[PDB]
Design a protein around this ligand. Sequence first.
Ligand code: HEM
Ligand code: HEM
Ligand code: HEM
Ligand code: HEM
Ligand code: HEM
Lengths: 304, 306, 306, 305, 306, 306
Amino acid sequence: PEPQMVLSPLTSAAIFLVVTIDSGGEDTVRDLLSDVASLERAVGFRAQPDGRLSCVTGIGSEAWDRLFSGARPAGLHPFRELDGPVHRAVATPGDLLFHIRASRLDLCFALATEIMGRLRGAVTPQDEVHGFKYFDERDMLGFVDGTENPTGAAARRAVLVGAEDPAFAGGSYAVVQKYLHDIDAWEGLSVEAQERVIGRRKMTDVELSDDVKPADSHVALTSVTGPDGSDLEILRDNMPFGSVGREEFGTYFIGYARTPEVTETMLERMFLGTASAPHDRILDFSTAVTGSLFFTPAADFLED
Amino acid sequence: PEPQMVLSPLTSAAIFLVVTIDSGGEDTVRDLLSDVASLERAVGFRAQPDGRLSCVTGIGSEAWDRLFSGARPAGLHPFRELDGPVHRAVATPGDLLFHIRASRLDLCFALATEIMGRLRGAVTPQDEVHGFKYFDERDMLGFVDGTENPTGAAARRAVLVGAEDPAFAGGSYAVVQKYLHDIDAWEGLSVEAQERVIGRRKMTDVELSDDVKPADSHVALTSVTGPDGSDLEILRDNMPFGSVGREEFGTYFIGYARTPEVTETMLERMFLGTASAPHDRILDFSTAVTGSLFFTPAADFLEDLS
Amino acid sequence: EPEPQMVLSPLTSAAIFLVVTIDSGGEDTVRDLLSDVASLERAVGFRAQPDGRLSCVTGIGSEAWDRLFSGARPAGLHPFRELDGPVHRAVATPGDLLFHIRASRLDLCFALATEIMGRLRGAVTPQDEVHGFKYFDERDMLGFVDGTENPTGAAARRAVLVGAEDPAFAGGSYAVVQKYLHDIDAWEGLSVEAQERVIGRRKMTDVELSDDVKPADSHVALTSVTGPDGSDLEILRDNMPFGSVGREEFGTYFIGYARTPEVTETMLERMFLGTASAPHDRILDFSTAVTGSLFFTPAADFLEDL
Amino acid sequence: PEPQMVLSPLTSAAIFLVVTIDSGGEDTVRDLLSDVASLERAVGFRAQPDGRLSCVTGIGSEAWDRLFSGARPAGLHPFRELDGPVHRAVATPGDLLFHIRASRLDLCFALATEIMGRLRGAVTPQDEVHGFKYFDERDMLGFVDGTENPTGAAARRAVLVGAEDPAFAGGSYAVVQKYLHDIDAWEGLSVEAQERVIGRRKMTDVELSDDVKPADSHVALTSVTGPDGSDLEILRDNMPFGSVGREEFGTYFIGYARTPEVTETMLERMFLGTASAPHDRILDFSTAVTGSLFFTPAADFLEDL
Amino acid sequence: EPEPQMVLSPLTSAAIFLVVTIDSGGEDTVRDLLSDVASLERAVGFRAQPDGRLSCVTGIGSEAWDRLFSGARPAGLHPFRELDGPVHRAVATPGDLLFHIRASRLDLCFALATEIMGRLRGAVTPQDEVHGFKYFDERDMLGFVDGTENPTGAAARRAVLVGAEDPAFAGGSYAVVQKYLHDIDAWEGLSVEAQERVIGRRKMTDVELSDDVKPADSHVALTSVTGPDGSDLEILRDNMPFGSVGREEFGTYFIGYARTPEVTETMLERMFLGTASAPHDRILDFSTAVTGSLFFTPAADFLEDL
Amino acid sequence: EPEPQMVLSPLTSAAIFLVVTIDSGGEDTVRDLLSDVASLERAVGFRAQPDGRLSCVTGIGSEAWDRLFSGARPAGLHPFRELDGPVHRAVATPGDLLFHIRASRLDLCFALATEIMGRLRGAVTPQDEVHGFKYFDERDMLGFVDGTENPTGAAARRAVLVGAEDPAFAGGSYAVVQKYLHDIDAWEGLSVEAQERVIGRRKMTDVELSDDVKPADSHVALTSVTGPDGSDLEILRDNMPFGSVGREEFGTYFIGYARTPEVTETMLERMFLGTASAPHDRILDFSTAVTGSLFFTPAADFLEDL
Ligand code: HEM
Ligand code: HEM
Ligand code: HEM
Ligand code: HEM
Ligand code: HEM
């Protein structure tokens, strides 16, 4: 089975589009799903090889039941709200996700325009974010963002559904959350204090040693080991976004995994805490304003 | 006199930031203006040579009077509203313009962030546009955009103030207008009908011959000759922008010239018409929602302040 | 695991197509060159890596095969079959060897062509030599994007490379070439909308026409073929413009690779002879074939071990 | 005055087009000349900044008098044939030259197509060459080609007409010659012998010292000093071309200069020789099959027609 | 199943070779660094992706292996074997750990080397450090293209990676290093044709000399080796120039990877000890080896699991 | 118009600094090489254009000038003046000729250095050779962006090139070089904010500290100098990192160009001897100078006419 382009090369621009399916819009959606790979080639082919345009399409739990009969993917459910002692991870509506990436924002925009052109009248937009990465892979907090992502075979094993759910092999599960940052409070920390929040050195991106790394740092809480002592991994492609005039400085989080269990365990540690950590210190500078979960099928499932 | 980077190499990303100066905000603004070139180097130097980051700072007519107590540039006045039989060019508030360009949007954003950080509490944002050019220099209507801009010495002569206003030599005048397009109506035209609106072939960007080019085409109405029969030219760096969710498809128009009279003559022909043309046909698919005029001083004028 | 030639190449902007016949007595000289052609490709190309992207694919015709080699023949190798349609004809022309040379620059193609022809001088007769160049946005001489629906990855290897069905020749492929000359004056008298109906895709944006509007005699409709089992039958194409402005020659050099010639031949029959719903491919009202040849391109190790 | 793009950045592709003007063709030609700069922007602008497309347009001596009334450039005359003891520099017909350059051949071809489209029925093609430079600036003989071209202000001084002919300031003079090489004979020389023909080391492109450089080497014979002891310089943009099937291996020579007398003095030394040298040894491997001279006006002269 | 180190790297234009010995008592510190070296590589390199192309290959010598690890040894691991020929000598020099660091820029190599040696200060003693750079046309200090006949693709993986013959160490490789200094004055007194007879390929065009004219004591002839079964035995080389113009040091740093050391050592025996028809490799009359060491480069997951 | 050497070069990522002394009797050989150095630069660099950006700036010291030439001397040419401060010392070390070689790749630098030293063999003795590399974000070995406040354009030409104040030497410049080694262990024991107070700019973003927080003994405060007439006195710097990981040598090679040595010397005095409000430049508590030399870099045509 041929996957979507979940494992993409590095891209410096993205558009995230989240929409809901209106009553009566199902047929128009199904038609667009069967064409979206052909649209990606149409927009992207003439700008190769620099363009690096791809679209990953996802489907939510409620929408799945409206669109398709027969089997459901084993791990597909609505995003679970987390109500922690201090911080909350909200659930927001979303039936379809389009994760569009390229080396330039204009290519993303052209593909987004063709997709939304086909869906006008059948869907209602819930969110639209235009992301850009800083030239040294830094995020809005000034830290390098992406470093410990898996690559090669390890990435395929962490991300792609396999024999455990064979009708949906080559699919993946995506979790999205839009975060807004309090940059004034963040910039009042010393660099060393910022390093203790994240768990890595700021300039050089070397991980803090085990003897200095706090238990409530982002890296400590999002490190999870499985039954057998192995690392449970996800693939992230976080993007900055914002608006200088409205004082909006953001990170759009997207995490792909072979089962939602990995990602959800990470989120529970961050928002609910553990015995050794009240919560992830990154959340004292970061508020989640969306939250949704999608299944991204194999490409050939959509092509039918 | 050293000009600002009005004549920039080609860039694929931009931020246009227009603000008003709040009462009492003058001193904070003057401070920032004296530092803006140093901020441009701080953000941009470490991303050389590919970053191509620049900022052009402009000052409106009313803002000028509040900030500076001596001589005014000869051509600086508020944007003049044009109230045509069908189409209108609105005047909207704007005291400062920052026209920020680079090869990547993140560099523009970082500079904009440092600028606005210094001005917080002294200004009110009026408009913010993040622009991106299509990879083949096309605009949102699908036409190549920039082709007949002047280059080299011809560009310097068309854009930079000289002997005619010697205390402001090395300056320029910028007009900005944000346009929203009706793309559904545009896409209902045949290609040949689109070509008759613009005045050039769509795929190849060859100009239509004098015998076929209509009098109400964009190229015909924005072609202007001077007293002496020479072409009057401006330098444009138009940028697409928009939001697919809200169905907003735009062109952010910016035109630089040595005197505003050139730009204003073009706008009068577009909105009020001529003997042979009621108005520029591009306006049947394009609505102006902002309009402002700014003087962009020489770099050394900004540096030598308090 | 047999190693194919570079049939699946990255995108290249230049090519040389060389077709020759083997003179009486030339067989031994040809066999020697075939055993060295991969080493010649590395010699010319290695020092221009990684930007040069030089490759050579070598093909052998049906009659030449019998003169060069004893033993097994590839199952699908035969001479190109003439198609004599009601209006349009696909000619067969002689060719014993093909050299399909590709790079990012024409000079690298030329240097390899020079070394190859240097070794063969006196043993072969040139039949055709074309120097091809792709336009910067992947467009062909008709102004349309060309290559968009080619298969990639695993699907390309499945469509192109001989496998278990002919195991002695696994890793090989079959190439069909046809040189086409266009009537550009007649083409350019069509509106863009009428050109789109000929091809089956939008010209500027390269989006396929919807199933309800795509004509039955459009190029895309006629070259879309489904198998017994309802799967798409695919080929890999690397069409190249060529020409001479002085002689008014504006061409497309067609080359198509497939695992069996049956797929390509079925496409040709539909284009030239038509179907129940279509007299012929409308692209042929603007395009005349002046060559036609079929070659087997062996696995690289077959050539090395000879 | 704004010159044409005679001083171009380095380009790896070119098309050279030479045509004659048919009976009655003058009006069509003048129309095209007034549009050629706008055609160059139309084809080139959307491929910037990598495309690097330019067109330099030249006009021959006889064609000048047919197209324009009034003043003539002072140095414009027909190419002068040189009939040497062994080698000959031929003159061939040519009224218009289009020297088209870009980073890629397809851009050159698109501009050539629009130009020839406008001239169909008014001109007759005499020569069409598609040139390509090797990736390390080498020519068909395997030597680096372009090294001692002038640059910056020295190039402007060597190439552009100035005060000496003020109505035509910003123009230049181009000489073209297509050469075919005997590659079999060249490749039978040792590298060291080829170096003695050229006057520079082959791999490293270092000039041979004055005490080793033979007097009949290409570099020695094309090194010319003026009245004042100053070097006389031209700007060259030689391009390989050919056809493997026809065994055609060529260099298309083009040289620009402020007056044709510099280039013509170089040609006399190559073909007729000096006291110490019978002829340029490069000509024992290189035969000229075309030769023409053109004036390339300032851009604004063409625009105003 | 096993993940190899980046032995099969893309082409890189810079490198650092660092060879150290492990001081008495330094074993625990070294083991800790080995378990972190892939994490350090990502830390330095991720922010320069995708153009940085930073990798480190870590090797372990025969004596050091016994000090660091208990259990199985790789089958082919032994100390480099000194070769004492009649004229030329291949010396053995001490070396416990190799770090073969490659990128598109020297600063990335340098930053990673700085982090590695930072962790190891006090536990190791440096024996050699070389900063290599490629000439722009892949030439070495002798003026010849260097790398041309390296295997690529599947053939490279087969030639380089340990497989089923030693399954506990599958995905590993064996590296031989030798630093060579050249006598450039003597080399440059040869004619080009005499240089070509030393190497066995043409200098400017890199075409191999024909079998009839290639000397038996040329570098290419002596390093071409066939197996019992008729097949070519191949290695993967990534030779780098280095030197110092003030001290008249012009060098080639030799590094050769192979699935078993026997292939590389057979090549070295032919070069230094000769054959019946060749006393020695003529390249050694202009090249002196001043180091020689052999290392096993384990699979990446072997290092991670420490 | 006197033609300067390439003192104002585009940004380069590699350099070689070569300092030599002229042996007794070596004068004639040196004069011959000086008359050829621009020809050597074109020979090596032409075939790598336009990306190579190879240039060589040649300097001559005070004592060497008097050995090579007769007549008038440049007005400001003297040997480097040793500074003996209370804590820190700026040493003077020997040097007759400087070759400042820059390019986008080290191999071009190396090839030109090789041809230069080839011509001078036997007539000079090497004193210093440094191969420099810039970090990818223009950072130096202390982790700060280095070169941000250099002047550019016309302001750089005014700061650097000799003019009417010394008209026989117009178009020349004066270069001061100092090799510095850093104590990185001590530097890395500071917090980032303490590092920022040493330099006078923020580390990650390279924004200058406000005048109310910037210490008087910071690097930027002590190297900011105004003239009698209120103007900034500027120099043009092209500092390069260098080092050796095995020897724990981490360096900055300082080179500063100016129209008169007095500007550079005033800055050095402030750094090493202090002012009323500052004992010394705090950068020197982590940085030791181990060389110091001063050279005049003549106009290009002065070298040619030898
Ligand atoms: C405000 C939102 C976020 C920001 C600004 C952010 C930023 C970062 C940074 C800077 C790192 C260190 C470098 C690296 O990418 O390895 C990191 C690591 C990581 N983050 Fe986040 N992150 C955010 C949210 C999340 C969320 C919501 C999850 C999981 C649900 C997550 C999972 C991870 C993981 C798994 C790593 C790798 C940890 C390791 O194993 O070393 N992050 N993040
Ligand atoms: C919706 C807003 C606009 C769009 C999309 C637009 C687009 C274009 C296009 C596609 C061209 C032809 C190619 C070229 O030379 O750039 C053009 C030319 C031009 N436009 Fe606009 N334009 C707009 C508004 C304006 C305005 C407001 C002015 C002046 C106030 C203006 C002045 C010009 C000029 C001077 C030319 C050059 C005509 C010539 O000399 O050939 N445009 N524009
Ligand atoms: C004058 C000669 C030709 C021209 C200019 C040409 C041009 C084109 C163009 C523009 C397309 C659309 C974009 C794309 O998918 O590449 C196309 C598609 C295609 N052409 Fe051609 N074509 C030529 C001859 C041929 C011939 C001779 C064949 C087969 C024997 C062929 C087979 C195809 C196929 C299979 C497709 C893809 C159809 C699909 O599945 O969507 N073409 N060609
Ligand atoms: C027959 C084909 C020709 C070839 C292949 C050729 C090749 C070369 C080569 C390799 C160089 C040395 C590197 C360089 O400085 O460019 C050179 C230099 C030069 N050639 Fe040619 N050339 C040819 C014809 C001509 C002609 C016809 C002229 C003059 C009318 C000419 C004038 C020169 C000049 C002036 C130089 C620079 C000399 C100096 O160092 O000052 N060449 N040529
Ligand atoms: C001074 C040290 C060396 C230099 C400058 C050098 C240089 C070269 C050059 C120029 C070639 C021809 C082009 C190529 O295929 O890469 C070559 C090929 C080769 N070298 Fe070396 N080499 C050196 C040492 C060694 C050593 C020590 C070995 C083995 C232990 C070796 C093994 C090979 C092999 C296997 C080939 C490919 C031969 C073939 O099958 O065509 N080299 N080398």
